[PDB]
């Protein structure tokens, strides 16, 4: 129902091993569609989803121009942030930026995003009002002052309310057969004895898109949140995702346990049990 576009920028310094590397990736929901790598033999914006390939030469040239300029800009930024923290030229450091727009189940802008991190720590973020900043420390306050002078928040508001939404809706239409197609999980329960009087029940969900899913185990109709092992949702490699939830049960008590699956691709939420 709801959709989003996100760009993810990563710039990493590497003293003694060349200039900092700049990588940019673009996503619509859980589907990557573009990439850029400054380390590539011939750095250029490349398609990563079939539905983006139809975009003309102007699109790709403009993307590449932007990312090539960002490569240089982020190298300067890394030099600046090193200075803000009194860090030596010897250590490796990372700046990450993620930005983009959310849409509800109708089409208009729900919320805009722009967030930055330095060495994995939140550094500066655009507030939900798309007008003000939250700076993490006195270093980020310098960045804030620069960004207020350069009208950055205003540029971001214009982009997030306008071009971001416009292009997301265009991508959603062009890639509708995949992006607006929810694939339900294929689900089953496996039984693995651990001892004479305990066994693991593992509830599988496979081949689903998007990644959003709820897998829960219940005993006598009561959630077993503390006793359930839930692995991180993982990509299958074919656009789809996988997940499982496992619970250790007393032997003979298996039928007191139910797995519940909630996903967009399903006509109705599933209730599953182990079938001997």
């Amino acid at each position: 129902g709801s959709h989003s576009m996100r760009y993810f920028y990563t710039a990493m310094s590497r003293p003694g091993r060349g200039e900092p590397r700049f990588i940019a990736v673009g996503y619509v929901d859980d589907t990557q569609f573009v990439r850029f790598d400054s380390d590539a033999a011939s750095p250029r914006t490349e398609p990563r989803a079939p539905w983006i390939e139809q975009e003309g030469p102007e699109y790709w040239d403009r993307n590449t121009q932007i990312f090539k300029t960002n490569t240089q800009t982020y190298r300067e930024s890394l030099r600046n942030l090193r200075g803000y923290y009194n860090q030596s030229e010897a250590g490796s450091h990372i700046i990450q930026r993620m930005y983009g727009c959310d849409l509800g189940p109708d089409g208009r802008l729900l919320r805009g995003h722009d967030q930055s991190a330095y060495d994995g720590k939140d550094y500066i973020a655009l507030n939900e009002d798309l007008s003000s900043w939250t700076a993490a420390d006195t270093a980020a306050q310098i960045t804030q002052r620069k960004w207020e002078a350069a009208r950055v928040a205003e540029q971001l508001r214009a982009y997030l309310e306008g071009l971001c939404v416009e292009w997301l809706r265009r991508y959603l239409e062009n890639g509708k057969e995949t992006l607006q197609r929810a694939d339900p999980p294929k689900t089953h329960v496996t039984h693995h004895p651990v001892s004479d009087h305990e066994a693991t029940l593992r509830c599988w969900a496979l081949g689903f898109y998007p990644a959003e899913i709820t897998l829960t185990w219940q005993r006598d109709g009561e959630d077993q949140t503390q006793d359930t092992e839930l692995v991180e949702t993982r990509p299958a490699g074919d656009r789809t995702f996988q997940k499982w939830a496992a619970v250790v049960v007393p032997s003979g008590e298996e039928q007191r346990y139910t797995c519940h699956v909630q996903h967009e691709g399903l006509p109705k939420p599933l209730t599953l049990r182990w079938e001997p």
């Binding site: 760009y7 990312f67 982020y74």
Partner: peptide
């Protein structure tokens, strides 16, 4: 489509 190159940090 990405936003234009914004000011450095």
């Amino acid at each position: 489509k990405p936003i234009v190159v914004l000011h450095g940090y």
